[PDB]
Each structure stands twice: as structure tokens, then as C-alpha cells.
Amino acid sequence: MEMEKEFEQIDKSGSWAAIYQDIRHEASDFPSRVAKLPKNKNRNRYRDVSPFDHSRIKLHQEDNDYINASLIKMEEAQRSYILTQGPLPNTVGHFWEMVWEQKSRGVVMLNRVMEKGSLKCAQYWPQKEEKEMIFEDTNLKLTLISEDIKSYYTVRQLELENLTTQETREILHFHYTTWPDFGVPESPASFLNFLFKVRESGSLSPEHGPVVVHCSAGIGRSGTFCLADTCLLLMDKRKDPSSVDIKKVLLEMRKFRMGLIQTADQLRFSYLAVIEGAKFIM
Ligand SMILES: N#C[C@@H]1COc2ccccc2C1=O
């Protein structure tokens, strides 16, 4: 069923809440035993958001290999994403260790450091060229190289140095800065624009490690980003652009991380983004 028609049918009936609860009911449930170990309590931002053991990213150290991050592997679309929480004051070094070990080219950030008057994640990147950051626990150095500030997003060039080997890489930071404090954007135009700039960078491409995507919990806005990317990629691949079932793609992705898409408004926004993306030029 063409999703544009499914869309108008749900909207006219106002059943978004009922569709959303059907997804929550059918979603996978796998063990998260490592996340719940007492040694890892200060490595988790939210008590109810944990990576499944089967899909969690492991840090390459013997001490404690744990980070709140999951590998989402979409087999037919041929895309991989790492979805993670906003780093905490004691996990900023772990975050950059993961970016290094997984060979990521891009970091996608969908939240502001402060929202609704509360801190949603640590200030984990340098704000001035001449004031670099050193993460002593993981032996990494991070320098701001350049900054390009636009109306809806900012792109930063960063240099990450492995102080152990003196190798360096260029990391692109894509920061979507205008998601509202409450609800979802009214139009998906600016989100889709931002999405097609991450692609153009090469950050989502198979010659690099998976892109690192985060918001505060790493399930809501982060969910919306990878669901819309994968659905548009499948529509360019499948003979029948009408065979792409967004609810089925979301349940496949929820086999790899719990809770992806946090509200019925985020589900509706995801539909709007995909359809329009299929409109525009597609
Ligand atoms: N390349 C490219 C672009 C840029 O932004 C878009 C926004 C909505 C729908 C499609 C697109 C593209 O394909």
C-alpha cells in the first residue's frame, strides 16, 4: 500500500497513537545484561535505555569494554549505523575511543547541549582552534580545524590524533541545531536537506566505518534519521517504490536497539520525511 495513501488514511482517522502502540507491542525484546552490571551504572544516561548484548559496540580494552552504543546493520539497504547516547562527563573519552576503533568518518548530533533549561549531553568537542581537548583515560587529542555555521545546521572539521601512534584522521561533525524543545519540526525540508549533506560528505558510504549518530538517549531523533535514510535508499533500489513498508523497516531496526522512535508524532514526522524525500526530485 503506497505510504502516502496509508498516511492520509491514518491522518483522517487520527489513529497515529494506535499504529505507534502496535509497533511497541510487536518490537523485539533481547537481553541487556552487560548494561545493567553495577560497574556500568555511571556509563548510562537513562536507566530505561540500554543496548542489547548481541548488537552492543565493544571498546578495545581489557579493563571495561562497555559503552551505551549499538550497531544497526541493514542487510538489504547495505547501510550500517552506530546509535549512541549523548556522552556523559565520564564517557567523553570512551566516545572518541569508539569513533577511532570503528573507523567512523562522521558524527551526527541531533540535539543542543542545553534544552528545556537542562544539560542533554557533555561539551565533548573544542569550541576554539587554539584550545584543543585531551582525553587522558583513552590517550586521544581533538582539535577544531574549521566551522561552517548555517541557519539549520553547523558542519565542523575536527582532527582526532591517537597519541599512542601519532596517527591522525579528519572527523566531520554534522550538528542539526534547530530541532524544537517540544514536538517535531512542522516541515521536514530542513531535516531532509541536512540528511542529504551527511550523504554528500561520504560519511554514510562503505569505504568508511559506520556513522556515529546521537541525540540525548540515542533512540528518538536518532531513530528518525536512520529510518528515513534506509527507507529512501530502499526506494531507489526496489523495482516497486510502493513495496517499502516503513513500519516493517522500523521493526527490523528495533531488533538492534530498543525504543527507536519515542512518540506517535516522531512516527508521523518519519512518514512525512520519507514521502517528501520521494517527492522533491526522487
Ligand atoms: N542531493 C540532494 C537532495 C537534497 O535535499 C533533499 C530534500 C528533500 C528530498 C530530497 C533531497 C535530495 O535528494
- Residue from 176, 280, 282 to probe ligand 1 pocket by mutation (most atoms less than 8 Å from CB): 280
Rounded distance between C-alpha atoms, residue 156 and residue 146, angstroms: 6
**Resolution of this PDB entry, in A?**
1.9
Handedness of CA 196, 201, 204, 207 (dihedral sign): positive
Q: How open is the CA angle 211-206-66, to the nearest 5 degrees? A: 40
Ligand 1, residue 192: give the atom nearest the CA: 7
> Obtained via which technique?
X-ray
Instruction: Report which protein residue has its CA nearest ligand 1's atom 2.
Output: 196
Rounded distance between C-alpha atoms, residue 19 and residue 213, angstroms: 26
Residue 215 annotated to the active site = yes
Sole residue written with cell 554528500: 200
Collect all residues with Cβ–Cβ distance below 8 Å to 94 and sequence separation of at least 6.
43, 59, 67, 87, 137, 138
Tell me which of 121, 215, 226, 231 is the catalytic residue.
Answer: 215
Handedness of CA 51, 65, 89, 131 (dihedral sign): negative
How many structural domains are present in the chain?
1
CATH number, domain containing residue 182? 3.90.190.10
Q: Alpha-carbon dihedral of residues 158, 273, 193, 249, nearest 10 degrees?
A: 40
CB contact at 8 A, 106 and 203 = yes
CA nearest neighbour of 49 among 69, 66, 22: 69
Give the DSSP H or E segment for 153. strand 153-162
166 in a known ligand binding site: no
CA nearest neighbour of 228 among 110, 123, 105: 110
Rounded distance between C-alpha atoms, residue 171 and residue 23, angstroms: 35
* Domain interval for residue 89: 1-282
CA of 203 to the centre of ligand 1 (A): 16
Do the strands 211-214 and 79-84 form a parallel or antiparallel pair, or are they unpaired? parallel
- Residue 49 is placed in which grid cell? 535505555
- Residue from 176, 195, 196 to probe ligand 1 pocket by mutation (most atoms less than 8 Å from CB): 196
Rounded distance between C-alpha atoms, residue 221 and residue 153, angstroms: 15
Collapsed DSSP state (helix, strand, coil) of residue 262:
coil
Instruction: Report which protein residue has its CA nearest ligand 1's atom 13.
Output: 196
Alpha helices in the chain (DSSP H): 3-13, 16-26, 33-36, 92-101, 189-200, 221-237, 246-253, 264-278
Collect all residues with Cβ–Cβ distance below 8 Å to 79 and sequence separation of at least 6.
204, 226, 229, 230, 233
Cβ atoms within 10 Å of 54's Cβ, excluding its own? 12
Do the strands 118-119 and 114-115 form a parallel or antiparallel pair, or are they unpaired? antiparallel
